[PDB]
Amino acid sequence: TQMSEAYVERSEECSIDHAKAYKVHTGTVQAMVNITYGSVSWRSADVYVNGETPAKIGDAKLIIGPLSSAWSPFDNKVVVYGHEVYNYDFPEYGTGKAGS
Amino acid sequence: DLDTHFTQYKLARPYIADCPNCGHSRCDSPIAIEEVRGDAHAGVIRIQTSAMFGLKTDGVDLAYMSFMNGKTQKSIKIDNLHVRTSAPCSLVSHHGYYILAQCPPGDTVTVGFHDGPNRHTCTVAHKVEFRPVGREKYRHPPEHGVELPCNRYTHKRADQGHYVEMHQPGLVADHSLLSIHSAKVKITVPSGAQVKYYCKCPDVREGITSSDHTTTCTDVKQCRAYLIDNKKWVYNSGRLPRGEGDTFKGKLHVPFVPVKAKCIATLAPEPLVEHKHRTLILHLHPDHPTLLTTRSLGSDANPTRQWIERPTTVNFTVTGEGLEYTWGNHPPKRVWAQ
Amino acid sequence: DLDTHFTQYKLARPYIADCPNCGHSRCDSPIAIEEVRGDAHAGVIRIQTSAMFGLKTDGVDLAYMSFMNGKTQKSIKIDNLHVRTSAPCSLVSHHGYYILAQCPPGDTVTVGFHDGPNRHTCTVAHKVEFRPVGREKYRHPPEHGVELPCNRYTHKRADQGHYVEMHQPGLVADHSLLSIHSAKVKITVPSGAQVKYYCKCPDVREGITSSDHTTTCTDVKQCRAYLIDNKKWVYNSGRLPRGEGDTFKGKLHVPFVPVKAKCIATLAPEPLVEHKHRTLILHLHPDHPTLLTTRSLGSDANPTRQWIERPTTVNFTVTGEGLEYTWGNHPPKRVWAQ
Amino acid sequence: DLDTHFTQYKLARPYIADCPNCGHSRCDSPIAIEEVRGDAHAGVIRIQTSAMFGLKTDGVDLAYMSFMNGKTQKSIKIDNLHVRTSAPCSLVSHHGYYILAQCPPGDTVTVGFHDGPNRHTCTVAHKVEFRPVGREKYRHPPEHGVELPCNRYTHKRADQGHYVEMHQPGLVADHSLLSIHSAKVKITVPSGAQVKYYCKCPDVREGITSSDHTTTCTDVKQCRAYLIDNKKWVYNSGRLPRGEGDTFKGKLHVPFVPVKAKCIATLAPEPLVEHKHRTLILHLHPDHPTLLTTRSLGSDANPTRQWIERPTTVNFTVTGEGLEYTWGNHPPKRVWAQ
């Protein structure tokens, strides 16, 4: 009689190449603004979009946003493969069909 | 600095197994292959052969291979280590059980060395394909172009990213140990190695001995000519039966760990751009099948992906919002409308 | 035993014919290929070369080859005999005129040893296609899987299923025999030969003789030297001029006749069933292009047969009558509905 | 006769250049490949390697080759020169920098000799297709058939149809000239050749000398180690720097000029003709894809042509004006109807 056994273990290549499932929320947007007003002719400010945060780089202080459109190109489910982003609908954890 | 891998070099020994297509049939070649990892991009393949080439018997001769012939190992030259596919391949590096080589695409992979009086080849059926990294589905690494972050197996060997277990091997039969003592069967030992021994007739039931004789059975074909020879451990291959005692230590690092290097990819010839009134005509001639993508900058993307092989002329309605296109692996370019 | 084949071993002679692609152009190679028979299943090829393999001049052998250079059979050890296709093959066995080899798919077959100072190869245009036995259009015999009643050529040689003709050789020409003695042309015979003298000058036109000389003619380019070597016999090849006499008998048995053996066939991955109301959703993940056949069990067969290669999901309407589907080489199964 | 082309023989000397895929990586092989010319009909290829094949040092040894090993050349035999593609090719003639061979179809071309202790091969990504003469899309030259006016490279070399410029090569670096004079970097000379020389630090600024020493700099990786050696000229290769002094003349003839030869072409099996009222029925059983064309002889030509691969039966409405058809490369036939 022969007692043969086998189990599935993730490949060594998983350390470098591997897809990443991601569920995303609304989040908060940021911007880099340059203001060359008056005679100062310069700014280099990183700012938010929430309608409370002041930004007081150099001498002037200002507030930005919130955005008029809540448009997010990302879907609720997002799959990231190394460098490119795909809005593929990964099913859920621990439920993947074989072959798919 | 090649002497810092003696765990692979000394604790392991050459090994033999069922090659599915050894020559004209399924013999038991000393270079039976298993777990070919053809998942890189630059055409490189990692092959785990049963034979364990590396240093010589004690500590030297990196340029020598050591396979097992019969009861014993034999360290010889590596003169004609051949790896083949639909087209002949080219060796790159070898270490332990694993040999790193690059092959053209093909349906089968073959490995064969040369003892000198013997061929000793082995092959297996396994799909091999290599799509280059990028949008230009070429078929051979080009002379020039742009670089991209490909996936390729490391050229080096002194890495410990992953490990492979080497336990004690399981007993191998060899009926040539069963010499004849005029009218009875006489087992003899390799160096004092353990010989699990017993026949279908009632006689010595264990065998942990020097050279015994058999009192009861007479025909060698009904006797256990086994060798327990775990003085040098082996990899837990699927072609070798398991040692009932225990899985010994000997956790051995994978020689060639895949890493995210930067391969050189091809670049398609630049398209000939012709402008019309509120429409973009792309006069282009692809050398190899390349996909081009277009994406409107307005609210509605209206994307279009299309691999093209033959020279073709395409058109695009460039709206006031604007249009952008990516021909091949060239950097993306956008466009206006009046 | 091996020496129980004297009819082909003693009497046959290695002949030389007009290979179509002898190296650069069509020379007269001693290995002129004839009657390539790639009609088996698993990819085994029978080639009827013009050389006589196996037998040394000295009765019989197997580690030797007899090929004809010049007027004499310069027999040697067979040592580097190539059998090539789109990829190089691996020969199985050789017996006199015939050599059985296993090749990968390709469109050309080339044969050649390499006697060392010279190559002496030969090729011929003939497509070789290998359909594996079964429902799966595979490429190479896999390690495992089910077995099916294939048909192929036996490696055994001691068979007499079929015979081929072998009669007296024709009048081989040899210009090198027309030497001159500074006054008239001198004919020569090596040993036991009986050459024919013919010349353009008005003289004795018949000239059947042993060692002798011309009557009057002097211009070597105005003569013919035909050689007779009726001591041995050659195969009835279509590239060799017929002897003017009788069809000498002697049936050379064909060493490798087709037989009904058992080849290992591939085994497609099991489909993933998913039941649905009066509907059979079938998930398929083929490894190689495999036939899928289904038929209704009711009064109307409603057949459906379509090759599937890329993984896809197909659905069928399983009525209360029942449905049957045969995926790959798996045994057929049946289904109901509620 | 063969020594009547000394313009190339003595005046030119092979050099080293940057092979795209030398061995396993981008090394600087002495057999660097340039200008793969796959334009012949019968699959004949011309390759221009940077190594000079042909005569020995002065005028002899057609069976020898000359490559450049570091700063000096060493002519050896042609023992194991091999040009290879998807399948191994068959060399026809070698002369100067050029090799003529007949390769199977394939995507990559490789050239490689064998020095005996090392391979020293090179390869470049460059597809080579087969273009059968005529209308019959075969894959290898058949042994018979009707011949056609193909275009093919000639095996002859004593031709003067075309020339290629052979200027003084640019200078080459050799860091092995930069020995150490115990504490300073020190430059030798090959034979009195011109050693252009200077370092980052201020020292001897030209270098037109015998073996100099450095006064200023210390590191061998901070000096120009050059050799102006235009006592022997080199091809105008795009992989070597060009000496700014001047561009020498000395154009030598191209070995293998294309010629309008006559290749054998395949002949498709003849059609089985069948007929009905004003209606030709045509049975076709092609072995390889062959173009069929038809043409009505009336006022309206009404042409129709289609590549047919699978066996098929087609029809044609034959008017009393008559109909012509040209299956394969068989002479055109024509007909009337009732």
Ligand SMILES: *[C@@H]1O[C@H](CO)[C@@H](O[C@@H]2O[C@H](CO)[C@@H](O[C@@H]3O[C@H](CO)[C@@H](O)[C@H](O)[C@@H]3O)[C@H](O)[C@H]2NC(C)=O)[C@H](O)[C@H]1NC(C)=O
């Ligand atoms: C913030 O925004 C202003 C307005 O767009 C930016 O002004 C532009 O700055 C560039 C240099 O970054 C000027 O052009 C460059 O000027 C130099 C000096 O004359 C010249 O050598 C370069 O060839 C180049 O022309 C540009 O004239 C100026 N204005 C405009 C209308 O573009 C400013 O740079 C931004 N500040 C930051 C910190 O990003």
Ligand SMILES: *[C@@H]1O[C@H](CO)[C@@H](O)[C@H](O)[C@H]1NC(C)=O
């Ligand atoms: C693209 O523009 C060319 C301009 O000559 C025109 O002939 C062709 O029909 C256009 N193609 C499409 C799909 O509109």
Ligand SMILES: *[C@@H]1O[C@H](CO)[C@@H](O)[C@H](O)[C@H]1NC(C)=O
């Ligand atoms: C089932 O059949 C429908 C109709 O032919 C088809 O569109 C669909 O892809 C099939 N498979 C599944 C999983 O629904």
Ligand SMILES: *[C@@H]1O[C@H](CO)[C@@H](O)[C@H](O)[C@H]1NC(C)=O
């Ligand atoms: C004529 O053409 C048809 C296809 O249009 C083909 O099926 C048939 O065999 C041919 N024979 C006749 C009826 O002329």
